[PDB]
Structure formats: structure tokens, C-alpha cells
């Protein structure tokens, strides 16, 4: 009850729309806030794309080493790693790491293309038992985050359940699951988001996202000190098309649900 009141107060103060789903694996409980509403995933969808490539690699041993050409025509709006590799190749492993750890949107597009496009990433989610996730578009248009638009959305409940399957469950083989977890633990973009609302000693693997309408998102697997792991999804979006980022709202939500 108190956690629900605190999240409602945070949402009101923020001016936007907040979605939270916590899974506590200690007792198989959930804390949910707007957890069945749809939110634009933005960059948080890169976890599903990387996982689809990892799944494909279970039956193709040379897959992560496969080379992909990077060209000027591949550049999109945010290319921190790929811009350094134009006119050479990157491996699928390198693209997965760049997408997950730097939010590189060329890397995301190469993962999407490799597996067959947005409908193939979506079909992979369905195969896992996630019937909510939809990836409709490529980068950069998947980030428009227009209110009322179901494209490129999921719910907090569904994303938390799927992230639990991918990182702690059996969606991926042991090598592939470990690789995903290692990649997420090495993320460089999340220190102001969920991590900022947790004690410094806790270990986090996370993936952020941002987009239009001030959309500010983070999804995480969390190892609290001497406790069973948690899964936390915090999704946030705002009424104004040009609203600014609000990573502090995600940190505040994380603090509320883990205190
Ligand atoms: Cl505006």
C-alpha cells in the first residue's frame, strides 16, 4: 500500500506516466504500477534483438564471429561505436556489445537485419512466451514514442517476465545466457537510471532507452548484497513532444520499490 502511494506521488510530481514492474526472486513476488499498460521501449528493445542473435548462435557456432560491413549508409542518429568502424567490419559479438553497452543504434539495426527484421525479433519474443512485446520499426524511427501509438511497445509486466527468462531463466543456453548477463553488467549508459536508486554495493546489468516525448526507460537484473536477484523495469514518458530526459524518475522509482 505504501509503495503504491509513493509511486503514485512520484508519478504525479513528475508530470508524466510511469510504469514499474519488480520481480523479487526471493519470494516470487511482484510490485506493479501501470504494469499492463503499453510504453514505447526505445533502446530497451536491444535486449530482445541481442537475445535473438544469441539464440540463433546456439545452432550456428561461427555466428558471433561473423563479420558485418559498416558503411556511411548505415549511420543513423546515434552511432558512438559504429562511427569508428566505417569502411571496415564488426563481428556480431562486437555489434551486440555495442548495442547493449553503448546503445549504438547502427549495431541495433545490424542485429535486427541479421535475424530477419522487426517481425522476426517479435516472432522470437512470441516463441519465448511473450505475447505483448512488439518491435515494429528499425532505428531511428522506433523511438518516436507518440502517446497512444502501439508501435514498438511492451508492458512493464511482460518485459520484466521476459528479462527474468533471458537473464535468470532458460530462454538461452548456458553460454549464451552468461554472455547476455556479462554484456548487460558492462553497460555504460545506466549509472543515472535504476543504478542511481540502489545502494552502491549492488550489482546491476541494465539496458536504458530514450526517445520522443521525454521517454526515459531502464530494464535491469539486480543482485543485491547477499540476496536473491531482482528484475526491475521502469518506463517513463511525458506529455510534451520535446520534453527532456528524466533519468532521476527511474532512480526514484527503483529506490521506492527496493527500500
Ligand atoms: Cl514540446
Author numbering: 28 to 286
Original paper wording:
CTX-M-15 (cefotaximase-Munich-15) is a class A extended-spectrum β-lactamase (ESBL) capable of hydrolyzing penicillins and cephalosporins, including third- and fourth-generation cephalosporins such as ceftazidime and cefepime, respectively. It is predominantly plasmid mediated, disseminated worldwide, and encountered in diverse Gram-negative pathogens, mostly Enterobacterales, but occasionally also in nonfermenters. CTX-M-15, like other class A SBLs, employs an acylation-deacylation mechanism to hydrolyze β-lactam antibiotics, utilizing four invariant residues: Ser70, Lys73, Ser130, and Glu166. In this study, ultrahigh-resolution X-ray crystal structures and mass spectrometry revealed the mechanism of PAS inhibition of CTX-M-15, an extended-spectrum β-lactamase (ESBL) globally disseminated among Enterobacterales.
